């Protein structure tokens, strides 16, 4: 019934980094072809981006994109990506059976970044590629010119370097799936030689080196520790992967599910430490969580398309049509994130164009339109700048079918100094079962209500879609803001942000 939070503004965790606002795209099914990059489309500008997509981007404002992979870049060959267009060879992705035609390589993809208010985040081939092809590619991208590969982009016709700054050593390399699967020591010690080596081209950058597929692979958190232990003084940042489902059709376990991510977080955040301690290191290693989302509804029809197949260009793959449920847990997590600012300095949303994603373009086509999991993401990186307040909170707890004490709120206040503003981003969870929320607000003084905004739905199993769009935010709502106390009520399974100024 009711919940009771006090928001104290000398109580900090950390500054919020714009960069846990990232995504990532990856050249798997339509993310680009029959996605962001369609040549001969009305809707698409000179170089064929989709000018629509082009605003939904700028609209969710992300400042990091991870680029190209995932699976595809532990195969690729980024020399096939660039130069003449007419000479790129065709490709086989063995990542995901398909055949690449490698029209969007690095120049193309670096100028859609730009036109979307975004910085790549490169990876490296470390599958089937080593230490001096990614010194090549680093070189191409940053050296400014008068060298071989330099030159080469110059000639290629971008005469300015782009000075990508953060770069990832490989794609998650522990899984039997993946092409160019390593050891955790065989990896630790590429990583640390390739890091060791980039650092020695361009020292400004930094590099993030692969953890774990998923926290359920046997070798997590060893792999973690002992990739640390060979690299630690070349890296600046450790990955972690995270997805979430719902085939069980269960919404209270569903939901409790950002419990587990936060103790995932704290489990890799201890690893470093550990790390840190071995090292005798004054230098912290940052959580770079470069895959999260929630991802389950296209696993049947995944399955179904190879199967046949294919190679397969640009097949429908990965495509969740997401619920207003999935949208209470992607909320959930941007705040379990949040919530970790302190560690977490970048993060991606996996993945930003038609390939589990908030955007989708429909076919031959399209198309274009918000999917539900939009909006917790839009609000998120619109207000959540600032600094993170620590939640001292008390909320009323409901067990589930798999998880046991698990608050009906969870929220987290994050405070702008600049803007003189506190969000509150809150959930509940449940069901079934409206709370309302009372928060002791210490310090602001002479401030007032600006807005409550509100993401709510009858269904939780509702849709949107090319026609809308049912899951949009309404500008509602209740509260209440007398003395310094904010009492909010909040819907039955609902995701909040109340404004104060």
Known sequence: KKARMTVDKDYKIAEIDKRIYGSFVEHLGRAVYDGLYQPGNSKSDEDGFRKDVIELVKELNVPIIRYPGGNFVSNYFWEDGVG??????????????????????????????????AEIMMAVNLGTRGISDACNLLEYCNHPGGSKYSDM????????PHNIKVWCLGN?????????????????RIAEETARAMKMIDPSIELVACGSSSKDMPTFPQWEATVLDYAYDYVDYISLHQYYGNKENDTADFLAKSDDLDDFIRSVI?????????????????????????????????ANIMQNEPWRIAPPLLEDIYTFEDALLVGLMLITLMKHADRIKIACL????????????????????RQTIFYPFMHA?????????????????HDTSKHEDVTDIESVAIYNEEKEEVTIFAVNRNI??????????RGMKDYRLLEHIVLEHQDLKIRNSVNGEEVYPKNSDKSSF?????TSMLRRASWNVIRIG
């Not at 490709?91 to 036109?115: M, T």
């Not at 998650?172 to 630790?188: I, S």
């Not at 007398?482 to 904010?486: A, F, K, N």
Request: net charge neutral; proline share 5%.
């Open 350 to 369: 996996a993945q930003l164009i038609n390939v589990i994603a908030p955007i989708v373009t429909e076919r031959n086509g399209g198309a274009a339109w």
């Open 84 to 117: 003449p267009v007419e000479d790129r060879p065709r490709r086989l992705d063995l990542a995901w059976k398909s055949i690449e035609p490698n029209q969007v390589g690095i120049n193309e993809f670096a100028k859609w970044c730009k036109k979307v208010n």
């Open 381 to 397: 990186s619109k207000y959540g700048r600032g600094i993170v307040l620590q939640p001292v909170i008390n909320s009323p707890l």
């Open 153 to 160: 982009r110059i000639k290629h016709g971008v005469k300015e």
């Open 172 to 188: 998650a390399m522990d899984g039997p799936w993946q092409v160019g699967h390593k050891t955790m020591d065989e990896y630790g």
């Open 270 to 302: 201890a690893t470093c430490d550990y790390i840190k301690a071995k090292k005798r290191s004054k230098k912290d290693i940052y959580l770079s969580f470069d895959e999260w989302n929630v991802w389950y509804h296209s696993n049947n029809e995944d």
């Open 432 to 441: 079934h079962e409206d709370i309302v929320l009372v928060s002791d607000v």
């Open 482 to 486: 007398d003395d310094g106390i904010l």
